[PDB]
Each structure stands twice: as structure tokens, then as C-alpha cells.
Amino acid sequence: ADGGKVKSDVYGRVEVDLVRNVVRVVESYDIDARMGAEAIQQLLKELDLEALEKELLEEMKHPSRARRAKARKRLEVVRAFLDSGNRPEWMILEAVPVLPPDLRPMVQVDGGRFATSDLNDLYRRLINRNNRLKKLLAQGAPEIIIRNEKRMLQEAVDALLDNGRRGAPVTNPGSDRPLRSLTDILSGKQGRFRQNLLGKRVDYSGRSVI
Amino acid sequence: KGEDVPEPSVPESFRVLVKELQALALDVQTLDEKDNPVDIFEGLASKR
Amino acid sequence: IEIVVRQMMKYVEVTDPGDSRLLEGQVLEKWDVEALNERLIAEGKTPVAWKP
Amino acid sequence: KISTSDPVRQYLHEIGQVPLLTLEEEVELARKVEEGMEAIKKLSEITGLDPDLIREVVRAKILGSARVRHIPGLKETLDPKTVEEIDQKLKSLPKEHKRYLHIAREGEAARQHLIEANLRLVVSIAKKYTGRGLSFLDLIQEGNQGLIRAVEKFEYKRRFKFSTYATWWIRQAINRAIADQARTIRIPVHMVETINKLSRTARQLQQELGREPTYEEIAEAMGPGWDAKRVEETLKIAQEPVSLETPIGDEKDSFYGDFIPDEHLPSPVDAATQSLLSEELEKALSKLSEREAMVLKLRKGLIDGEEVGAFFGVTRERIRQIENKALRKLKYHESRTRKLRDFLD
Amino acid sequence: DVPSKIGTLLDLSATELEQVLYFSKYIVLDPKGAILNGVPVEKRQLLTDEEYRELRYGKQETYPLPPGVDALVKDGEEVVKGQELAPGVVSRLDGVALYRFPRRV
């Protein structure tokens, strides 16, 4: 192969110099080095619970309390998976669903004033990024930019599922208020849940002095 | 018209929950007698 | 105060397994279930030893 | 741990490791970037494989294996057979021809370093287009989107240094990135500018009078086709959308949302109306002679509400004919049994 | 989540490995990696940016370019093209360039 990725014998990097026949051979190899959800996703794919389960069965009951104690909290989860559950490769994301539209409105307020939920922006956030990631991966890019964007891509993906977990993003200045993340809407984290059991409104109700 | 009231459909809070939950990786399905699906959002979630 | 109370006890720890490993903490009767079907019907008793 | 300190540290290091000579090495990699295109355009003049192919298989040979062509983009190209067979054709090229590939490779290679180097230049500019609506890392990011964009356009033969050439592009990038991703609602660049001036004049207006200008004063100041109607119209769009969720009244649990009613839905006294309307209209719809009734039941009623293109094949005269007589004969038997009188709608 | 379910199933630093590999490039040696850092391939153990660089591009990449004009320029050419420059070669001009790394120039 020409100046570049050229896996030779135990040494695998070849630089060319057509001046004098000098087939440069720098010495690295097929050292699969990955970072980000990738390596994780991979490491999970290549798992066969049945093996790790039995391995800990031994790891557990025999070694000293020390390395056997952890081995148990470790087998507990593995088992749940391995049970009637859903095979554990899906804890990773490669496709984020998208809450409906009318469930995060783009309303008319006071004339020019528009009304929009705090999640549509935590999405545009992603969308733009995810794309940007793609354009630059096409555009052909130096390394320190792919990861850096990949990084930022991570953030946003959490930021939409659940904010503040690592950091608290904010609509551009005016509101230092956090953007309403998903489970937030679930837990009623901002005094929402309570209200949910604080009541709902009956259809044919009344009140008045006794 | 003078007839008993139709038994309750699904609670918007629920539904809003299920979708507000799928919003996150997770997946909340509803099952019958046998661990097989039951369609709360009737029809709508079928694609196209 | 006897009702609510038993709901503070309706939990038992595990030590001598069979199905799933030891220290699990599970409902008192759910264990009256497995234990009951292991020494009564599906023989070869696996006396789940639990702690209140 | 807290981002940017890393993403800046990430290239301060590499850059800090290879700051390409202001002229020399920028020229080096520069030269070794044009002979890339030259080469490839010529390879294509021999392989028949589109410039895209030659340009795509040389990158996958240097930067990333099959893995890179599989995830970032699906499988249009076979991880094995496709690429390998394409490069297989580059080795079959004679000495004279295999010559350019060896160039094409080192070149793209040259495109790598050059870009990685000037990554400090990006953040420098980026350090100013900060407050708009784009994250700082984001800013940097679309900032690189102009730098690597420079790499294609530069002309080392024209002696002007590189750093300064990237400047323009880069700033161009960040700017489009500001007009695009900064808001929730998209407005054109034309209106974008039309908004700055309209906000820039308000400035000199705050300067004197004391009265935050009426849409008359601001309109004059601006210029030509600017009518008081426009400014009141142009500013409503200026203001940024308001949170559907916001502490309402005595800020407590009460969320701003419950305050906005609904409409698409027929509030019971509307559904109840359909059942009477629909059942009654259809009823009178059965004591009519099929024809016109149907073509007008299906015309206004079915597809979309042209007396001419109305009835099947009979002319307009028999259309109106039975029309105004049937319709009206319809109206006077209903008026009797007062079913539809009370305007349900 | 306190109980790192991807840190438990994967005996990776329950909360520190992932934490250091997820949000950046503190690479984990997924499949093989034949070569050594003195020791064989760390099947499931991570390495530094600086060390990964020492793998890919081999050990060294230094660019000690000379000062003045007719100085070190004569110690270079004469002792650069082909000469298997051992570790610690002593270029002799401005200060003392130090070619402390192996095989070829």
C-alpha cells in the first residue's frame, strides 16, 4: 500500500519515498483502539452471559468473601438479563425515539409571541449536531475534531433524555432555568409529580360556602 | 341520549407518560394474560 | 396498627439459595411459594433458609 | 469531566506538538494537497471510476478501514470486495500511472496535518463570535467547517500565506452557522439583516427623545419602503418564542400550560351536534332523487367543496334545474318538521 | 445510575473506566493489539493518548530543526540520509541536538 495504512509483517506502517527505493516501515499493528460508546457497544456485543454467569457461580461460592462479594452483585444483574428479559445489547443508543408533536406544542401566544415546550430545543440541539457530525465525517476531517464533535454529540443525547445528570444546559440567556428533560417530565422533578397526585379536575364539580 | 356512561378509555396522563418515557431509550409495553401485547394508543402507533 | 405493621415485616433475607443467589431480600410468602413447590410437588427439596 | 477544557486541551497538545512552519511546512502540505486533486482527476481519466470513488478509496486506505464506510454510512460499498477491488485497480496501473496514487495517498495525508495544525486558529476567531446562540464548542465546530473548506480552495502557487486565507472561510462558516442554528424558528438571512438594522436604529433613537419610539419614528429613520405597519410586524418575529412551560401567576406549582385551551377537539357540545346534524342531514338526504343530491353531497361533502364540472355528464341547466328545486324542496319539508332550524352550528 | 449496569455487566471501572472512556478518547483496546508497551496486549485495559500515539506512529517523531545557516546543516546532511542513527546521536552545532531515538533518519 502507499504512504500510509500498510500492515506488513509484525510491523504495519509504510511510508513511501520514490527518490531512492526506501519502503519506510514504522512498527505499529492492528491494535484495535476505540473510544466512545463504540468500544462499549462492541464489548457488549461480544458477550455470552451463560459463560460469565457460570464463571461467577464459581467465582462466588468459593473465593474469599472479598472477590466473591462483588462477584454476586455482578451476577445479580447478569441473571436478570439472562432471564426472561431482553438480551442486554440494547443499553446503548444508535436510534433515539421522538416524543410526539402536540405533546410539546408550538403555540400562539400574544400575537408575535410563540409558545414551545422545553424539549423541542433539546432535540434541535441533537439533530444539528448529529448532522454536523455526518457532514464532517464526509468532508473528511482531522482526528481532534471528530471525537470533539462525537463528545458533544454524547452530551446532547443525555441532555434530551435527562438533563443535569452531567451538566445543566440552558436556553440562551433570559432563563437560567434548566430545559425540561424527558424523565423530568416523568418524575415531575420540578414540582409536577406532586401536582399530579395533588389533583386533576373533575368534569361536573362545584364548590361554595356551607 | 340517556344511557350509562361508556367505560373509561386510556388516561392521557398515562399515554403522555408512555410516550414521554419512550422519549428515553426505554420501552414500556402493556401485556395481556399471556405476556403478549395490548394496544393502549389504539391504532395510532401502527406505522403510516 | 397491625395491618401496616406486617407490611414492615413482609420482607425476608436469603442465605441458603437454590434458584437465585443468597442475600436477595424478597416477599415473605413469595418464598412460601417456591419452598412449597420444591418440597411438596417438584421433589428434591431446596429448603430456602430465610431470615426475618 | 467538564468538556471544552479537554477539547481545547486536545489540540493545544497536538498543535503544541506540531505547529506547522508559517511558510515552509504550510507550503509543504499545501503543495502536497493540490497534486492530490491533479492526481485523482487524472486517475479518473484512466479508471473510469468517478472522482468520488478514487477520492473515497484513498481516504479509506489511509484514515479508516471497512468500519468507517459501514457505520457513518450504510453498506452501499462492500467492506471487503468493493474498496479492495478498487485499489486492486490502482496497483495494476503501470509505473507511470501507479505514480499518482502514491501521490494521492501522501496528499490526503498532507491534508490531515495542515488542518490539525490550524485548529488553534479556529478557536482564536471562535473566541469572539461567542454570544449569539451557538455553544462555544459548537462555534468551534462549524468553525472547522470553514477551515477544512479552505483546504480545497487554496492555491499555493499564489504566494499568499495560508493562515490568512482560512480566516475568511472560517468566519464565513461561523456566520452561516449563526443564521441557521441559533434560533428555534427559522428566518431568512434577508430578514436576519433586516432585523439588525431595525434594531440598530432603535439605538440612536434611545439616544435622544426619551420616548421608546413609536413605530412611526423608527420607520422614518430606517428608510425607503418602511411603513409603520412593517416595523410592528417585523419586531413580533424578532422576539424569541416563550416557554410553553413557565411559572404562572404566583409562581408555584401552577404551570403556564394549563392556561392555553385546545381547539381541534369538539368540546362535547360539538360532538353532540354532529350526531344530530349528521343523522338529520343524511335523513333528508334520503328523501331526494339520488342524482344531484349525491353529486353535491359528494362535491361539497366528500372531496372538496363550479356548477359546471358538477354533475356527471348532464349539462348545467339540469344541474341548477333539479338543484334549486330539489335543494329548496328539501328546505321546505325540513322547515316543517323543524329539525335543522335551530342552527346546530 | 449508582449501580453502573454497564460497569457491572462489563467489569470496567464501575464508574471510572467508562467515565474516562465514554466522553472522550481514552481508548480501550477492544480486540487484539499484538505489539507491546513492554507488556503484551491489554485485552480489556485502557491506555493514554500519548501512549496510543507511540503505538500507531511507532515510538518517535521529533523535528529538531537547526538554527543559523551554515551551522548544524552540515552535521545533518552528512549524517542523515541512510545512516542508521543510534539512540542519543550527538549532532554537533548550536547547543547539542539530541537524536535520542533509534534506527533511521
PDB file of C-alpha atoms in Angstrom, chain D residues 107-108 124 161 185 201 248 259 287 303 332:
ATOM      1  CA  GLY D 107      -1.516  14.108  -0.289  1.00  0.00           C
ATOM      2  CA  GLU D 108      -4.720  13.330   1.624  1.00  0.00           C
ATOM      3  CA  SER D 124      -8.963  32.044  18.176  1.00  0.00           C
ATOM      4  CA  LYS D 161       0.124  32.590   3.088  1.00  0.00           C
ATOM      5  CA  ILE D 185     -37.813  29.234  14.490  1.00  0.00           C
ATOM      6  CA  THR D 201     -31.651  52.279  14.524  1.00  0.00           C
ATOM      7  CA  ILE D 248     -47.537  31.421  36.015  1.00  0.00           C
ATOM      8  CA  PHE D 259     -53.639  28.254  30.723  1.00  0.00           C
ATOM      9  CA  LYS D 287     -85.978  11.637   0.526  1.00  0.00           C
ATOM     10  CA  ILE D 303     -63.633  15.562  -1.801  1.00  0.00           C
ATOM     11  CA  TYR D 332     -89.367  23.323   2.903  1.00  0.00           C
TER      12      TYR D 332
END
